[PDB]
Design a protein around this motif. Structure first.
Motif, PDB file in Angstrom:
ATOM      1  N   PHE A  25      17.713 -28.328  11.313  1.00  0.00           N
ATOM      2  CA  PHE A  25      17.008 -29.547  11.260  1.00  0.00           C
ATOM      3  C   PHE A  25      17.676 -30.565  10.582  1.00  0.00           C
ATOM      4  O   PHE A  25      18.290 -30.527   9.471  1.00  0.00           O
ATOM      5  CB  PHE A  25      15.831 -29.426  10.654  1.00  0.00           C
ATOM      6  N   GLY A  26      17.966 -31.891  11.064  1.00  0.00           N
ATOM      7  CA  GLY A  26      18.461 -32.851   9.989  1.00  0.00           C
ATOM      8  C   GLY A  26      17.394 -33.517   9.274  1.00  0.00           C
ATOM      9  O   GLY A  26      16.258 -33.728   9.806  1.00  0.00           O
ATOM     10  N   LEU A  27      17.699 -33.516   7.947  1.00  0.00           N
ATOM     11  CA  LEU A  27      16.662 -34.031   6.981  1.00  0.00           C
ATOM     12  C   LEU A  27      17.371 -35.272   6.444  1.00  0.00           C
ATOM     13  O   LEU A  27      18.328 -34.989   5.848  1.00  0.00           O
ATOM     14  CB  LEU A  27      16.294 -32.783   6.187  1.00  0.00           C
ATOM     15  N   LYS A  28      16.295 -36.251   5.961  1.00  0.00           N
ATOM     16  CA  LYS A  28      16.876 -37.282   5.088  1.00  0.00           C
ATOM     17  C   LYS A  28      16.587 -36.872   3.506  1.00  0.00           C
ATOM     18  O   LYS A  28      17.473 -37.191   2.751  1.00  0.00           O
ATOM     19  CB  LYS A  28      15.790 -38.490   5.363  1.00  0.00           C
ATOM     20  N   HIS A  29      15.585 -36.100   3.396  1.00  0.00           N
ATOM     21  CA  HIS A  29      15.474 -35.442   1.799  1.00  0.00           C
ATOM     22  C   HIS A  29      15.298 -34.276   2.067  1.00  0.00           C
ATOM     23  O   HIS A  29      14.151 -33.510   2.209  1.00  0.00           O
ATOM     24  CB  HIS A  29      14.215 -36.085   1.334  1.00  0.00           C
ATOM     25  N   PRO A  30      16.311 -33.216   2.162  1.00  0.00           N
ATOM     26  CA  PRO A  30      16.377 -31.708   2.517  1.00  0.00           C
ATOM     27  C   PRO A  30      15.924 -31.114   1.067  1.00  0.00           C
ATOM     28  O   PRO A  30      16.028 -31.623   0.070  1.00  0.00           O
ATOM     29  CB  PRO A  30      17.517 -31.455   2.583  1.00  0.00           C
TER      30      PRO A  30
END
Lengths: 104, 103
Positions: free
Chosen positions: B6-11
């Motif tokens: 999953f690509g996340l802005k705030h991982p």
């Protein structure tokens, strides 16, 4: 009720709901007139060389409904989905219904 | 991401950790920082608990589907389990695409 009005609908599905699954199957049947509306005393003597094949009984003009096979309630994909995920099962209820009759 | 996931802005934040240093035997002032340290290491436990959301499959496929199964022939060892020496074995890469859907 009426001639031009259906007696029931066709329900045929499965519905998994946790620890319960309800299956439903509808089918079309045909009933012949057996024994020309009579009762006959059927009987047999020893056949095949075994007197265990010798019986005496009665054939009636009735037919019956048999739902005693698993593949009459389960699809191959719902069976598989059961034997791969559960440790056992047992029947809880039953509810048969006959409708949309037509005599020819 | 080209590698899947999953690509996340705030991982999930990065959690850093280190052993606070403890000086060796210093005996005199020096405006120079101390370089003699006692050698140490630390051990401990870490528990991580994730919650996932699932999407139930509701297909009206009739015939049976394909499943991931433990299909080995003449097993000399059990997969996904430690061998004689105690070393964990894993001979397969299990993916995720097994069920089907009418496009």
């Amino acid at each position: 009720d009426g001639v031009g009005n259906a007696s029931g609908d066709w329900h045929c599905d499965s519905t998994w709901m946790g620890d319960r699954v309800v299956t439903k199957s509808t089918r079309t049947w045909v009933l012949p007139s057996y024994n020309n509306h009579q009762y006959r005393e059927i009987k047999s003597g020893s056949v095949d060389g075994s007197n265990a094949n010798a019986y005496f009984g009665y054939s009636t003009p009735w037919g019956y409904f048999d739902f005693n096979r698993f593949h009459s309630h389960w699809s191959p994909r719902d069976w598989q989905r059961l034997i791969n995920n559960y440790w056992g099962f047992r029947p809880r209820s039953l509810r048969v219904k006959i409708f949309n009759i037509q005599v020819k | 991401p080209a590698m899947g996931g999953f690509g996340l802005k705030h991982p999930p934040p990065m959690m850093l950790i280190k052993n606070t240093p403890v000086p060796g035997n210093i005996t005199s002032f020096s405006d120079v920082p101390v370089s003699s340290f006692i050698t140490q290491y630390s051990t401990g436990q870490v528990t991580v608990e994730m919650e996932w959301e699932l999407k139930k499959e509701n297909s009206k496929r009739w015939n049976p589907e394909i499943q991931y199964t433990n299909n080995y022939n003449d097993p000399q060892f059990v997969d996904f389990a430690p061998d004689g020496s105690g070393e964990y074995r894993t001979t397969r890469a299990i993916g995720t695409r097994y069920l089907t859907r009418p496009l």
